Amino acid sequence: ADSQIQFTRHASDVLLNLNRLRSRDILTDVVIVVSREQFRAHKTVLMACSGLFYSIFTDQLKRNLSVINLDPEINPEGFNILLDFMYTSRLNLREGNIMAVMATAMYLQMEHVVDTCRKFIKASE
Amino acid sequence: ADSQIQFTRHASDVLLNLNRLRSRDILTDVVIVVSREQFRAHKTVLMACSGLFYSIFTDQLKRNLSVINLDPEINPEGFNILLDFMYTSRLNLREGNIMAVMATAMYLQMEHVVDTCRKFIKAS
């Protein structure tokens, strides 16, 4: 019964605006603590990209936490790269960082990223 | 050596997952009341699509309201169709609601949707 108009750039515009909200710290509602470091983010975005975060915020004792500590074993530069991805679509992979990037994606239960890390050490010795 | 990979279906998969959260009422943080109807949503999604909602949740007396009442003149069906659009990309229009949809989009300061409505008044 409806004429439906799909806006092919909507999803990207939305994601772009979510990133501006992030970097202006608007409605951010949680801090992710990774060893030293702190990353402000929106819980819903986290939950929309990782089933790890989904399992966390879906716990009624944890829904309303405003701070979340990750595994001490986790690399802060790896998580920062994954966090920017989640907000931008762009995974910035270096020869220097890729090690921990992949351990993070794995930890954050995001295989499509794991797989592009493996599919990246094609350009390898 | 150095690199940057863009996942082209990522934005799309995020939006898809945001809409499942909504449809399961997971982390929704506001109810929008439009006459006698109520719609649960995520404030960040609202602010990421509508200029009106950006201003509401950016006023610090309102940032943390969990109920927002739209102007009484706003139509529940028109609102529903825009909220679905925010969460899916799909604007579902019919001849018997297209003008209400357009009025609502003006109010929510989503002007490209308004132009699309106007422009979809070719056949007609």
Partner: peptide, 17 residues
């Protein structure tokens, strides 16, 4: 360094159950 494109879908899909 170079910007490349991936068509990979996300493995993470929020359930509906």
């Amino acid at each position: 360094r170079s910007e490349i494109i991936s068509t990979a879908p996300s493995s993470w899909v929020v359930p509906g159950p």
